Amino acid sequence: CNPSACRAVGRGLQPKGVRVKETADFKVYTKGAGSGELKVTVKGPKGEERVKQKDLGDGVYGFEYYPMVPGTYIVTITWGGQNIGRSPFEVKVGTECGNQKVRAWGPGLEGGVVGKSADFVVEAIGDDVGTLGFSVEGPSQAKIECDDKGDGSCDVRYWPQEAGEYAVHVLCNSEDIRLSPFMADIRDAPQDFHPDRVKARGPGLEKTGVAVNKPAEFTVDAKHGGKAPLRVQVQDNEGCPVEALVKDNGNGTYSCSYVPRKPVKHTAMVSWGGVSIPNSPFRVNVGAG
């Protein structure tokens, strides 16, 4: 029986950023713990909190609670009677978020690879932003970089140097933005993984010539990337996911298209096993024709 093998991670265990009326979610990995029983109890300001539990397979269990009053929640998680991780976890639940001034999206908000950068973007909703705060909490300290591109958006990357779950906070005027912290699963990649050998090419990714209501086309050649999942994510500059269509050609290449519907800046992010490929993100000016 090895309690120390267990790992409890997730947004519902974070000291700050969870809010009333959100689902507060977390999971507990148990493989290696051996014999024993997993016990999860959540307390809120008024006492016992209902917790929904799911078997997620491979020794992983999922949990959700539903805080309705701001304040102090404590999550006690044990295996064979001993606390797992830094249990009990004290979680401060905030009131409802105020008006939002930025959105954040991209692959670094959900995953990544040890020793590689984990990348995303923060975009202005209006012409007001003020200060953005970035912090990354996880098994060790990831260096963070940020670059204001002058178009209302900022590229952000961090550098996780150990496997595990990282909580990425984006603050706007001192409050975690809606959905912050973003929980990213960082893995040590196998030897055949080479996301820097993946290449995107095509008119759809160029800085002139892309026009509204036509297919913006490009290809992804991942023949030498090793086996990993492709992720293509395209939005306009107003927060709207743009429908993109990615066909697996069966031979390590993908044919991709999106049709922009507004003559505004579009950004395309292309990643291989959670790692942005060369030249990603692509910022594309769409014109009338």
UniProtKB/Swiss-Prot annotation:
Q: Tell me which residues bear N6-acetyllysine.
A: 31, 223
Enumerate the Filamin repeat regions by residue range: 1-93, 94-186, 190-286
**Which body tissues produce this protein?**
Ubiquitous.
Localisation = Cytoplasm, Cell cortex; Cytoplasm, Cytoskeleton; Perikaryon; Cell projection, Growth cone
Q: How is it modified after translation?
A: Phosphorylation extent changes in response to cell activation. Polyubiquitination in the CH1 domain by a SCF-like complex containing ASB2 leads to proteasomal degradation. Prior dissociation from actin may be required to expose the target lysines. Ubiquitinated in endothelial cells by RNF213 downstream of the non-canonical Wnt signaling pathway, leading to its degradation by the proteasome.
* Transmembrane feature ranges: none
User: In the UniProt annotation, what is the result of changing residue 129 to L?
Assistant: Found in a child with developmental disabilities; uncertain significance
- Describe, as the record does, how this protein assembles with itself and its partners: Homodimer. Interacts with PDLIM2. Interacts with RFLNA and RFLNB. Interacts with FCGR1A, FLNB, FURIN, HSPB7, INPPL1, KCND2, MYOT, MYOZ1, ARHGAP24, PSEN1, PSEN2 and ECSCR. Also interacts with various other binding partners in addition to filamentous actin. Interacts (via N-terminus) with MIS18BP1 (via N-terminus). Interacts (via N-terminus) with TAF1B. Interacts with TMEM67 (via C-terminus) and MKS1. Interacts (via actin-binding domain) with MICALL2 (via CH domain). Interacts (via filamin repeat 5) with SYK; docks SYK to the plasma membrane.
Related disease?
Answer: Periventricular nodular heterotopia 1: A developmental disorder characterized by the presence of periventricular nodules of cerebral gray matter, resulting from a failure of neurons to migrate normally from the lateral ventricular proliferative zone, where they are formed, to the cerebral cortex. PVNH1 is an X-linked dominant form. Heterozygous females have normal intelligence but suffer from seizures and various manifestations outside the central nervous system, especially related to the vascular system. Hemizygous affected males die in the prenatal or perinatal period.
Q: What is known of its domains?
A: Comprised of a NH2-terminal actin-binding domain, 24 immunoglobulin-like internally homologous repeats and two hinge regions. Repeat 24 and the second hinge domain are important for dimer formation. Filamin repeat 20 interacts with filamin repeat 21 masking the ligand binding site on filamin repeat 21, resulting in an autoinhibited conformation. The autoinhibition can be relieved by ligands like ITGB7 or FBLIM1. Filamin repeats 19 and 21 can simultaneously engage ligands.
Q: What family does the database annotate?
A: Belongs to the filamin family.
The name this protein carries in UniProt is Filamin-A
Recorded source organism is Homo sapiens (Human)
